[PDB]
Write an enzyme that holds these catalytic residues in place. Structure first.
Site, PDB file in Angstrom:
ATOM      1  N   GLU A   1      -2.650   7.332  -4.126  1.00  0.00           N
ATOM      2  CA  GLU A   1      -3.808   6.412  -4.253  1.00  0.00           C
ATOM      3  C   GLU A   1      -4.735   6.429  -3.058  1.00  0.00           C
ATOM      4  O   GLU A   1      -5.734   5.808  -3.133  1.00  0.00           O
ATOM      5  CB  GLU A   1      -3.529   5.156  -4.683  1.00  0.00           C
ATOM      6  CG  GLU A   1      -2.468   4.946  -5.947  1.00  0.00           C
ATOM      7  CD  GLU A   1      -2.275   3.367  -6.156  1.00  0.00           C
ATOM      8  OE1 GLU A   1      -1.078   2.999  -5.410  1.00  0.00           O
ATOM      9  OE2 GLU A   1      -3.085   2.864  -6.938  1.00  0.00           O
TER      10      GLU A   1
ATOM     11  N   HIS B   1      -0.079  -0.027 -10.569  1.00  0.00           N
ATOM     12  CA  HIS B   1      -0.783  -0.955  -9.862  1.00  0.00           C
ATOM     13  C   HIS B   1      -1.126  -2.078 -10.425  1.00  0.00           C
ATOM     14  O   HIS B   1      -2.182  -2.549 -10.735  1.00  0.00           O
ATOM     15  CB  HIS B   1      -2.114  -0.273  -9.246  1.00  0.00           C
ATOM     16  CG  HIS B   1      -2.725  -0.618  -8.011  1.00  0.00           C
ATOM     17  ND1 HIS B   1      -3.328   0.108  -6.927  1.00  0.00           N
ATOM     18  CD2 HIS B   1      -2.897  -1.799  -7.573  1.00  0.00           C
ATOM     19  CE1 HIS B   1      -3.540  -0.468  -6.105  1.00  0.00           C
ATOM     20  NE2 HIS B   1      -3.302  -1.659  -6.214  1.00  0.00           N
TER      21      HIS B   1
ATOM     22  N   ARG C   1       0.793  -1.189   0.101  1.00  0.00           N
ATOM     23  CA  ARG C   1      -0.059   0.198   0.108  1.00  0.00           C
ATOM     24  C   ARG C   1       0.888   1.295   0.006  1.00  0.00           C
ATOM     25  O   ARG C   1       1.897   1.113   0.538  1.00  0.00           O
ATOM     26  CB  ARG C   1      -0.770  -0.045   1.227  1.00  0.00           C
ATOM     27  CG  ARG C   1      -2.159   1.027   1.175  1.00  0.00           C
ATOM     28  CD  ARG C   1      -2.967   1.044   2.622  1.00  0.00           C
ATOM     29  NE  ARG C   1      -3.483  -0.111   2.526  1.00  0.00           N
ATOM     30  CZ  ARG C   1      -4.224  -0.355   3.989  1.00  0.00           C
ATOM     31  NH1 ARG C   1      -4.122   0.465   4.884  1.00  0.00           N
ATOM     32  NH2 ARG C   1      -4.661  -1.506   3.923  1.00  0.00           N
TER      33      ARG C   1
END
Lengths: 328, 329
Positions: B266, B293, B237
């Site tokens: 993000e 991603h 993440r």
């Protein structure tokens, strides 16, 4: 069809949600069932939703040999023997990041209610004698004063963010510091612990254990604080020596103490008292208390229950639960 | 007439055929994200919606889509949906099972090799038409004998440890809950504290599970503890790495390289979010390696995620309780 036991009251939608993939044994009351009754209900259950007063240990797990998953509706797992759950092939899952904000907001409420004498204030109104303004209940304001957040974990950052607009002097200490972007945005300045204690009008202990143990706001720490300062504990009952607070309150060192958590809640400790000290309960003038309402927000509790339920549903379907912290 | 399903992003033709048996399908023919106004224009009178990660379903959205009966999200989580608002509007909200573990682990190892062997620079040299033989350049860093550490040993961390086990490395991991003794032995992965991992590892891989997340696990303090010339790989993440701290360590020489599949950009749920990847990282083509991603950008996985989201929509439209429901409307 498997059976799931819920130890505490959940919203009716959670029961309908779980019911499609299990038979639900809910707690239809808002009270904690005794350990004997919880064990009796879960004895042949495949899943259990555990809450804070639940203590899953070796004895619990051997009485419940059909347990496949414990979906805890909690952030911490201090009352679970995780490795024993692994031993017994039981998925153990938790729910993160949902309790942070409502705990930060209640901490700020605890600060305002204590510093502005809002409890005594409400007592004056209900007494029926209010006939206008009086030079009474003069308190301490936020702007211009110094607040220190010891420990800058998730909850501390949520408090600093909310206090940033109150034109305070915000201090914090942590072994790991914030970055300059965060420090500048919340106008929060890093100091040491001894510096924090000396300079602060309000002290908020708040970090989930990393380099600390228990009773960390003790008599020694209280002797370093400003005379007439305030202490606000919405973190954990163990971080504050309540008898030291009683003494400091009486000596004048502390002007107030507010708390959402108490030492009696730490069933994991042996030095645990079994009540909140009467001296703290009798001192309505200098104390503000709430019964572990840190996450008692209808919307949040529903989403906490939903996450525990989905973990249970996932584990019962053969998937790996999203909130798992172990591996059976 | 059949019910109407709006799909906010591209799906494989096979999914459109599947849905079209029970419904009129309004697909996204492009690989672009539609503006929210356009999604509301198509779903204004839709009976079902398939949502993806860039979707944000709030109360305002639901009030403009009164005929909505089910939202089939092709996601493992639901952080971008107002679930209670869906319930109060009578809208089933469903998700799919987590299928991203293995293709993410494979991509992190792809990130590690491409970064440490200067494979991007290498390709650039070939494309320039100037290659005419081996040269003593692009000498990178190897895996065999070097120490790699996984911070957080979730499903992804285990998938990586299992795969790196054959690379003859010294694998370290740190985690609150220990691995099984059987896996520690099979994968020759040894458990240490967080301080020991940063001090000893040539390669640091932050791979935190959902249940153990915190912000900025790799920050200025962590980088200062790491070995000089170490490499960092972030396909977990964005929030777990302080990107501005990374930029400093790249400039000071402390970090030799940084590879990422995720970016702080993000995290629309965090307030300290920037809206672009820092230019200092975009320009550093010699010490970085990024992908947009692509962690689960594998066709068979994407197809299966689409198939299960479509099944939920189909079930819900038939009057059934969908298999992946997270609410009861």
């Amino acid at each position: 069809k498997p059976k799931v036991v819920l130890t505490h009251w959940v919203h009716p939608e959670i029961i309908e949600l779980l019911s499609a993939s299990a038979d639900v044994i809910p707690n239809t009351t808002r009270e904690t069932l005794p350990r004997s009754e919880v064990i009796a209900r879960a004895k042949d259950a495949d899943a259990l939703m555990a809450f804070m007063p639940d203590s899953i240990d070796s004895a619990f797990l051997e009485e419940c040999p059909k347990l496949r998953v414990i979906g805890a509706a909690l952030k911490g797992y201090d009352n679970f023997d995780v490795n024993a759950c692994t031993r017994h092939g039981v998925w153990l899952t938790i729910v993160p990041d949902l309790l942070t904000i409502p705990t930060a907001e209640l901490t700020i409420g605890l600060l305002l209610g204590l510093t502005r004498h809002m409890l005594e204030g409400d007592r004056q109104i209900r007494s029926g004698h209010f006939q206008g303004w009086r030079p009474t209940l003069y308190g301490s304001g936020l702007t211009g004063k110094t607040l220190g957040i010891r420990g800058m974990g998730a909850v501390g950052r949520a408090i600093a963010q909310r206090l940033a607009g109150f034109e305070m002097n915000l201090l914090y200490c942590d072994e790991i510091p914030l970055n300059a972007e965060q420090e500048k945005a919340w106008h929060v300045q890093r100091v040491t612990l001894d510096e924090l204690l000396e300079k602060c009008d309000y002290v908020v202990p708040m970090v989930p254990m990393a380099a600390e143990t228990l009773h960390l706001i003790d008599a020694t720490a209280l002797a370093k604080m400003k005379t007439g300062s305030y202490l606000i504990n919405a973190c954990r009952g163990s971080v504050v020596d309540e008898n030291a607070v009683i003494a400091a309150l009486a000596s004048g060192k502390l002007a107030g103490y507010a708390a959402d958590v108490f030492e009696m809640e730490e069933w994991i400790r042996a030095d645990r008292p079994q009540a909140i000290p009467k001296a703290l309960l009798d001192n309505t003038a200098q104390t503000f208390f709430t019964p572990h309402l840190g996450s008692a927000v209808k919307e949040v509790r529903l989403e906490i229950e939903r996450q525990a339920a989905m973990n249970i549903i996932q584990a019962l379907a053969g998937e790996k639960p999203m909130g798992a912290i172990n591996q059976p």
